[PDB]
Amino acid sequence: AQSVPWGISRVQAPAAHNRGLTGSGVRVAVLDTGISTHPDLNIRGGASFVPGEPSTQDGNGHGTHVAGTIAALNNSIGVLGVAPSAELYAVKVLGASGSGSYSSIAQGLEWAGNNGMHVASLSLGSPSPSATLEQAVNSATSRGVLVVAASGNSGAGSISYPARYANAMAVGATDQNNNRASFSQYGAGLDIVAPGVNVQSTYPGSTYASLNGTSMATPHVAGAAALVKQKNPSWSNVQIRNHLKNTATSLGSTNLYGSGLVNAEAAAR
Ligand SMILES: [Ca+2]
Ligand SMILES: [Ca+2]
């Protein structure tokens, strides 16, 4: 039996599924610790930018979990992604420890723009800016990539980098009560929020796990962007971004939630 994690229903993905919008033909790069082979995922390819870890398999668990929120297959097992037919690419920029350099991240962004990705999902935020990171976010954007980045988990009233850059769509996290998760960074530049607490998804070892963080919120938005792209193949990254913000569910404070809660079914109708 397939279960639908609460965040998946919270964003109204199933209603878009019923209308035929599944992410078909949309290319999504997961910039994270890698993605492990799993019965509920279909990995199309990828690259590793982590010295010493040449494989795109996941040695941490984070990248596999993020991937599942985006595109766990719609079938009789496991979970269900926002965009179950999306074309998933594993872009390993974080080593098994869960950390990486500004230069491996930057190389992963360049990779996405150079290989025609439509969406790039970045889970890690840094407290300090990086001219290298900023260049990479701009380059991917000009090559038509929608860069979706986590706001960060410090609980502070300002957002991490690269989420803070103008060309990155910054995503915070809500809890099951639609309130701001305690750790979710907010403030200037926050574009939207999605579920980030108690998120069940795919995990190495052909299993499932629940994790918390802004990196769990991010894939919900990347997945929603893939449904919009499928519905509107001629739209640009900027059109998609603006349409997601415009169809988001207002939660109140723009400081805490930006445009509000992503709504996959309102964005894709
Ligand atoms: Ca499944
Ligand atoms: Ca931003």
CA contacts within 13 A on the Cβ side of 56: 17
193 contacts: CB under 8 Å, gap ≥ 6 = 171, 172, 173, 174, 180, 184, 217, 251, 257, 258, 260, 261, 262
Do 221 and 248 form a contact (C-beta atoms < 8 A)?
no
Distance CA 259, CA 155 (A): 19
Using omega within 30 degrees of 0 as the cis cutoff, is the peptide bond preceding 162 cis? yes
Secondary-structure percent of the chain, ordered helix, strand, coil, rounded to 5? 30, 20, 50
Distance in angstroms (rounded) separating the CA atoms of residues 177 and 113: 37
Two tokens, residue 197: 């607490």
Q: Are strands 190-195 and 207-211 parallel, antiparallel or unpaired?
A: unpaired
Q: CB–CB of 126/160 below 8 Å?
A: yes
Query: Is 208 known as a binding-site position?
Result: no
Structure method: X-ray
Residue 157 CA, ligand 2 centroid: distance in Å: 14
Report how far residue 107's alpha carbon sits from residue 228's, in angstroms, rounded to the nearest whole number.
27
SS3 state at 257: helix
Please list the active-site residues.
Answer: 32, 62, 215
With beta carbons less than 8 A apart as the criterion, state whether 123 and 168 touch. no
30 contacts 121 by C-beta, under 8 angstroms: yes
Residue found by looking up tokens 């098994």 in the block:
96
Are the CB atoms for 111 and 91 separated by under 8 Å?
yes
Tell me the backbone φ, ψ of residue 89, rounded to 5 degrees: -115, 130
Q: What does the alpha-carbon distance between residue 110 and residue 198 come to, in Å, rounded to a whole number?
A: 32
Q: Which domains does the chain have, with CATH numbers?
A: 1-269 (3.40.50.200)
Q: Is 75 exposed, middle or buried (0-12, 13-18, 19+ CB in 10 A)?
A: exposed
H helices present in the chain, as ranges: 6-10, 13-18, 62-71, 102-114, 131-142, 214-231, 237-246, 254-257, 264-267
Using alpha carbons only, give the angle 35, 38, 39 rounded to the nearest 5 degrees.
150
CA trace torsion 37, 96, 86, 120 (10° rounding): -160
One-letter amino acid for residue 22 of the chain: T
Ligand nearest to the CA of 75: 1
Taking alpha carbons only, the member of 132, 137, 159 closest to residue 217 is: 159
Using CA atoms, how far apart are residues 63 and 31, in angstroms rounded to an integer? 8
Q: How many CA atoms lie within 13 A of 220 on its CB side?
A: 36
- What is the CA(138)–ligand 2 centre distance, in A? 12
Measured in angstroms, the resolution is 1.5
Q: Which of 43, 87, 79 is nearest to 63 (CA)?
A: 43
**Is residue 2 a known part of a binding site?**
yes
Nearest ligand, CA 158 = 2
Is residue 77 annotated as involved in ligand binding? yes
